[PDB]
Design a protein around this ligand. Structure first.
Ligand SMILES: CC(C)(COP(=O)(O)OP(=O)(O)OC[C@@H]1O[C@@H](n2cnc3c(N)ncnc32)[C@H](O)[C@H]1OP(=O)(O)O)[C@@H](O)C(=O)NCCC(=O)NCCS
Ligand SMILES: CC(C)(COP(=O)(O)OP(=O)(O)OC[C@H]1O[C@@H](n2cnc3c(N)ncnc32)[C@H](O)[C@@H]1OP(=O)(O)O)[C@@H](O)C(=O)NCCC(=O)NCCS
Ligand SMILES: [Cl-]
Ligand SMILES: [Mg+2]
Ligand SMILES: [Mg+2]
Ligand SMILES: [Mg+2]
Lengths: 150, 151
């Protein structure tokens, strides 16, 4: 356990960001994925409203998550939106996912955020079991609609 | 009322209309004990390059609106848009305002070259589901939403 480190990426961590994206690509089984150019990814990493957390063994990325800050108009305290979370399939069920969620909520707690939220597909049984083990404050059944643009 | 209804995307000198919309949200969502954040905060939010508000106007009266957040992607150079809140004044519902707000919002992000816009509704909110389904979305997915209320 001493071996696992959690790191919040900084603006000079593009190589680690790209490792994480490649982990996403593999774990989510994305086919024919063409990674965006590094200038785009750098600009994203530079944003003050986006935070990436990774899990490291040595400097091998074995999991991570991405999150977005949503400034509120209902409150001065912001919300954080955990977008993606994944752990290397060889390293799953070792407490890594849990440590990532803990660190993430700890970070936004110290930043004085109101809440953090995250979502899973109703079909995704393994994800559901995971989030339900993280002592979330609550869960809600929602319907997600999207419009694919021209 | 189509001839008189106007959709406006708020700009940075539109804080009065932003506040009017928040007051509409408070009414429509029937929020209790709401203390609106100070104007310095709301102004800073309005000034962000990742936040866009559309309002529906009957003359100078806000009768609906929606807020949306930009989410730049790492899977694509094309960003996503997240519609967070949408409401129409109760006196003016079921007259096509909600549809015109969605339409305007998707047209805008289409001009901006976004990949996709998404919006959510609670599964028990049958009337909201009815509404979104009438706007002809590309697809809908069942999702479970978890949150962590921070200390
Ligand atoms: C939908 C809403 C957001 C604004 O949209 P609107 O102006 O009322 O809706 P529109 O007039 O543009 O048209 C949508 C119609 O809603 C649906 N609808 C019609 N009557 C309805 C009713 N009594 N209840 C629910 N949906 C109804 C129709 O399916 C649809 O048009 P259709 O005739 O083609 O089937 C509004 O009703 C509202 O603010 N409700 C309370 C707040 C809310 O739920 N917001 C969304 C979640 S944040
Ligand atoms: C969940 C995930 C994201 C990372 O989690 P992880 O490091 O493997 O999970 P943890 O080891 O921290 O598990 C914590 C708890 O999840 C729960 N859990 C139950 N079933 C599980 C399963 N099939 N997989 C993972 N966690 C499970 C356990 O209670 C577990 O505690 P325990 O081992 O003491 O019983 C990882 O499984 C994953 O990447 N899955 C594929 C991608 C994905 O679905 N991501 C979420 C959607 S974006
Ligand atoms: Cl690479
Ligand atoms: Mg670093
Ligand atoms: Mg367990
Ligand atoms: Mg204006």
């Amino acid at each position: 356990d001493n071996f696992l480190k959690i790191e919040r990426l900084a603006e000079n961590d593009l190589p680690k960001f790209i490792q994480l994206i490649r982990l996403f690509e593999a774990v989510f089984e994305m086919k024919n994925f063409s990674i965006p150019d590094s200038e785009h990814l750098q600009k994203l990493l530079n944003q003050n409203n986006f935070y990436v957390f990774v899990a490291l063994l040595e400097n091998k990325i074995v999991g991570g998550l991405t999150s977005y800050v949503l400034e509120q108009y209902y409150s001065e305290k912001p919300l954080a939106y955990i977008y993606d979370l994944a752990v290397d399939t060889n390293w799953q069920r070792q407490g890594i996912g849990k440590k990532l969620i803990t660190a993430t909520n700890q970070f936004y707690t110290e930043k004085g955020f109101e809440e953090v939220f995250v979502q899973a597909d109703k079909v995704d049984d393994y994800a559901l079991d995971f989030y339900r083990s993280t002592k979330p404050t609550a869960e809600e059944q929602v319907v997600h609609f999207y419009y694919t643009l021209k």
